[PDB]
Amino acid sequence: ASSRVIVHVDLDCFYAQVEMISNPELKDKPLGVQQKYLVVTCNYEARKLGVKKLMNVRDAKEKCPQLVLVNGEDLTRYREMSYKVTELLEEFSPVVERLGFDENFVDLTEMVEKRLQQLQSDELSAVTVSGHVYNNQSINLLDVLHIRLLVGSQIAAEMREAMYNQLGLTGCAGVASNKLLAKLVSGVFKPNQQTVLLPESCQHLIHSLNHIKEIPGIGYKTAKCLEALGINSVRDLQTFSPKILEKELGISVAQRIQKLSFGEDNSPVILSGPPQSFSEEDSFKKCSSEVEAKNKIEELLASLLNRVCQDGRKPHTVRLIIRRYSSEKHYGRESRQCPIPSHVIQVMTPMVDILMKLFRNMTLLSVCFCNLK
DNA sequence: AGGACCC
DNA sequence: GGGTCCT
Ligand SMILES: Cc1cn([C@H]2C[C@H](O)[C@@H](COP(=O)(O)OP(=O)(O)OP(=O)(O)O)O2)c(=O)[nH]c1=O
Ligand SMILES: [Mg+2]
Ligand SMILES: [Mg+2]
């Protein structure tokens, strides 16, 4: 269990795709999915006209006045389609890890190997790639790692075809030897295309990034830290002192991100299975007076109860989350958590009242059920 | 409870 | 507007 073949599947303009399927009249029209003041995503017709992902509505309608907007605040249908995609992938190989609602990783290593043991010592020379080869790299048919990655590209093309034929969804895929690289390479040709990464082009792909924030795993805060240190390019990170990095970011953060800067990433694809929590949210800027609003909490609850039910298992914890107004105090939500009584597991009024007291203990209200069993 | 990451 | 795992 050394060399892996991993695929990262990444759907095209996911919420917009779901809305275009629901209302066929939105096809070939420029479309944005709105949540509050944000155009959270848009179809590719809208991107040709200047609309970017996560652009506020104002900027977006003055870049593109004719933009059709649909409301995407209720995630129900996106969430449903997202699990349909994961399940279809699980049918290929069971170990599928979700990332957000529209990305999945699958470890294809076992599948690839079983396909190779099936071919004769003749048709191995007929193995061909499906889709793009990153950096137009030459294939060496006597290189076993090349052969396995190409069989990985064929599986990926089968997955994308099944998604289209069974669920009507288009998506990109990237095939590589670990999750970092599969995820980086999946986005090289978009929309609705796939690319495979041969090992010799791994430095080319990593150095194609323009800042270390682009590395999945290095977030807003770590990037701000690395900068403070004079680290800006992937190369700066690759060459920087391991010791200074260690005694500055913790040993954990430091040795992992430095590895990532080389293209190295041993993390396993983890079976996501059923979700670990179920929540719903409501935003309203200045609107929570601090008493009048629990009617909101009752609404969040009623939706949640139907979902948490549906699932089969039951939650043993409830949590209440709030955010508060004033100045740009850039992070700071607050939560109170307590167990759910065992009487009340086996519905509304007692839940509403647990919530209200938790409220009393303490722009945004949400409820989250977790600790499912 | 809260932090940091992800989409 | 969701979601994960770690401290
Ligand atoms: C980053 C992000 C994504 N999303 C949602 C909208 C997207 O349709 C879905 C997947 O995110 P992404 O894959 O980044 O975006 P996308 O699928 O819409 O577009 P692309 O073709 O470039 O892949 O997640 C949010 O709601 N909020 C966020 O902050
Ligand atoms: Mg994505
Ligand atoms: Mg996507």
CATH number of A18's domain: 3.40.1170.60
A156 vs A92: CA distance, rounded Å: 10
Q: Is the peptide bond before A191 cis (omega within 30 degrees of 0)?
A: yes
What six digits make up the tokens of A261? 């800067």
Q: Is the CB of A40 under 7 A from strand B?
A: no
Q: Is the CB of A220 under 7 A from strand B?
A: yes
Tell me, rounded to whole angstroms, the distance of Cα A64 from its chain centroid. 27
Q: Which of A74, A92, A107 represents a domain boundary (last residue)? A: A74
Q: Determine whether the shortest distance from the Cβ of A14 to ligand 1 is under 6 A.
A: yes
Exposure on the CB side of residue A307, measured as CA atoms within 13 A? 23
Closest C-alpha among A357, A348, A358 to residue A302: A348
Residues A145 and A163 in one domain: yes
- 3-state secondary structure string, A78-112? HHHHHHHHHHHHHHHCCCEEEECCCEEEEECHHHH
A108 vs A177: CA distance, rounded Å: 10
Q: State yes or no: is A299 an active-site residue.
A: no
CB A205 within 8 A of CB A261: no
Closest C-alpha among A143, A147, A156, A148 to residue A189: A156
A203 vs A207: CA distance, rounded Å: 6
Method: X-ray
Q: Determine whether the shortest distance from the Cβ of A280 to ligand 1 is under 6 A.
A: no
Residues A150 and A282 in one domain: no
Cβ atoms < 10 Å from Cβ of A352: 14
Cβ atoms < 10 Å from Cβ of A2: 4
Residues A4 and A112 in one domain: yes
- A352 CA from B6 C1′ (Å): 31
Question: Which residue shows structure tokens 């955010």?
Answer: A323
Closest C-alpha among A295, A297, A258 to residue A281: A297
Query: Strand B within 7 Å of which CB atoms in A 313-332?
Result: 331-332
Residues A287 and A264 in one domain: no
Q: Is the CB of A101 under 7 A from strand B?
A: yes
What six digits make up the tokens of A149? 């990655």
To which H or E segment does residue A220 belong? helix A220-228
Catalytic position from the list A103, A110, A158, A200: A103
DSSP per-residue letters across A23-90: -GGGTTS-EEEEETTEEEEE-HHHHHTT--TTEEHHHHHHH-TT-EEEE----HHHHHHHHHHHHHHH
Q: Which of A178, A197, A216 represents a domain boundary (last residue)? A: A197
A128 vs A151: CA distance, rounded Å: 8
Q: 3-state DSSP call for residue A175?
A: strand
Residues A270 and A282 in one domain: no
Q: Is the CB of A219 under 7 A from strand B?
A: yes
CB A150 within 8 A of CB A138: no
CATH of the domain at A339: 3.30.1490.100
A26 vs A244: CA distance, rounded Å: 53
A44 vs A27: CA distance, rounded Å: 10
Could you tell me the residue range of the domain that residue A284 belongs to? 275-373
Q: Compute CA distances A319 → A280, A296, A314, A347, whole Å.
A: 11, 15, 15, 16
What six digits make up the tokens of A246? 């260690």
A62 vs A260: CA distance, rounded Å: 39
- A336 CA from B2 C1′ (Å): 11
A208 vs A122: CA distance, rounded Å: 37
Closest C-alpha among A100, A71, A76, A70 to residue A86: A100
A178 vs A169: CA distance, rounded Å: 25
Total tally of structural domains belonging to chain A: 4
Closest C-alpha among A117, A123, A91 to residue A104: A91
A311 is in an annotated binding site: no
Q: Compute CA distances A78 → A33, A73, A85, whole Å.
A: 12, 10, 11
Nearest nt (C1') to A14 (CA)? B7
Residues A128 and A100 in one domain: yes
Q: Which of A26, A58, A74 represents a domain boundary (last residue)? A: A74
What six digits make up the tokens of A155? 């599986």
A31 vs A53: CA distance, rounded Å: 11
Residues A122 and A145 in one domain: yes
Exposure on the CB side of residue A120, measured as CA atoms within 13 A? 2
Instruction: List Cβ neighbours of A3 (8 Å cut-off, separation of 6 or more).
Output: A109, A145, A148, A177
Residues A53 and A151 in one domain: no
To which H or E segment does residue A305 belong? helix A295-310
Residues A157 and A29 in one domain: no
What six digits make up the tokens of A352? 């509403």
Nearest nt (C1') to A10 (CA)? B7
Instruction: List Cβ neighbours of A369 (8 Å cut-off, separation of 6 or more).
Output: A277, A278, A279, A304, A308, A315, A317, A318, A319
Phi, psi of A277 (to 5 degrees): -155, 165
Q: Determine whether the shortest distance from the Cβ of A11 to ligand 1 is under 6 A.
A: yes
Residues A133 and A7 in one domain: yes
Burial A144-169 (b: 16+ CB within 10 A, else e): eebbbbbbbbbbbbebbeebeeebeb
Closest C-alpha among A126, A127, A134 to residue A112: A127
A106 vs A271: CA distance, rounded Å: 9
A47, A85, A102: residue to mutate for ligand 1 pocket, most atoms within 8 A of CB: A102
Instruction: List Cβ neighbours of A22 (8 Å cut-off, separation of 6 or more).
Output: A77
CA angle A166, A172, A178 (to 5 degrees): 115
CATH of the domain at A243: 1.10.150.20
Residues A2 and A149 in one domain: yes
Residues A298 and A264 in one domain: no
What letter represents residue A183's amino acid? K
What six digits make up the tokens of A121? 């010592």
What letter represents residue A326's amino acid? S
Pairing mode, if any, of strands A103-107 and A6-11? antiparallel
Q: What is the resolution of this structure in A?
A: 2.1
Rounded to the nearest angstrom, the distance between the alpha carbon of A364 and the centre of ligand 2 is: 26
> What ligand is nearest to the CA atom of residue A14?
1
